Design a protein around this ligand. Structure first.
Ligand SMILES: O[C@@H]1[C@@H](O)[C@H](O[C@@H]2CO[C@@H](O)[C@H](O)[C@H]2O)OC[C@H]1O
Length: 185
């Protein structure tokens, strides 16, 4: 499918050279950053969407995630489906596991306090995570069957909000450097 949303957010720290390429393609070169999220996807997320991507380059030198990323409002929730990472594997409060698209993911919940959100300003919100147990190899056509994650989260009392915001296949980083090139469809 054609992507219709371009996400390019940085808190202003360091260098974040994000390129909005042709179709669903984008690349990022980052150096000595603060927090940032770059990615392509859809303006309105869906719990039924099947996301396809191919990360031609996934080369983080530090803390960075290659992850499905999105938000819902009512309640405000930031969610992730992490396929690969750099030096740090994100974890939180363990809820259980889900097998999807050839991999096994651990399910975690964390909370952010006085942090930036899609609404602007700062607030406290919950984060839902599905983190692969082992890094998924990159360079190949990968699929994330999002429904499997949504259903598993629900079975663990992790309900998403009623108002869906954007949903993208992103490159997130925190105080690191690196490069990525990803195509989303
Ligand atoms: O849409 C943008 C959001 O992506 C941003 O929220 C931060 C995203 O990075 C995560 O690591 C943080 O938890 C989260 O605060 O807020 C700005 C908004 O424009």
């Amino acid at each position: 499918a054609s992507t219709d949303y371009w996400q390019n957010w940085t808190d202003g720290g360091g260098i974040v050279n994000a390129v909005n390429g042709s179709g669903g393609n984008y690349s990022v070169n980052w150096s000595n950053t603060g927090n940032f999220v770059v990615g392509k996807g859809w303006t309105t997320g869906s719990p039924f969407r099947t996301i396809n991507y191919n990360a031609g380059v996934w080369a983080p030198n530090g803390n960075g995630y290659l992850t499905l990323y999105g938000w819902t409002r009512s309640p405000l929730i930031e969610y992730y489906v992490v396929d690969s990472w750099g030096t740090y594997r994100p974890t939180g409060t363990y809820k259980g596991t889900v097998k999807s698209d050839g991999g096994t993911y651990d399910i975690y919940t964390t909370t952010r306090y006085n942090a930036p959100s899609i609404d602007g300003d700062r607030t406290t919100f919950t984060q839902y995570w599905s983190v692969r147990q082992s890094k998924r190899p990159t360079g190949s056509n990968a699929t994330i069957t999002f429904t499997n994650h949504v259903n598993a989260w629900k079975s663990h009392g992790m309900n998403l909000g009623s108002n869906w915001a954007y949903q993208v296949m992103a490159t997130c980083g925190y105080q690191s450097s690196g490069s990525s090139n990803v195509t989303v469809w």
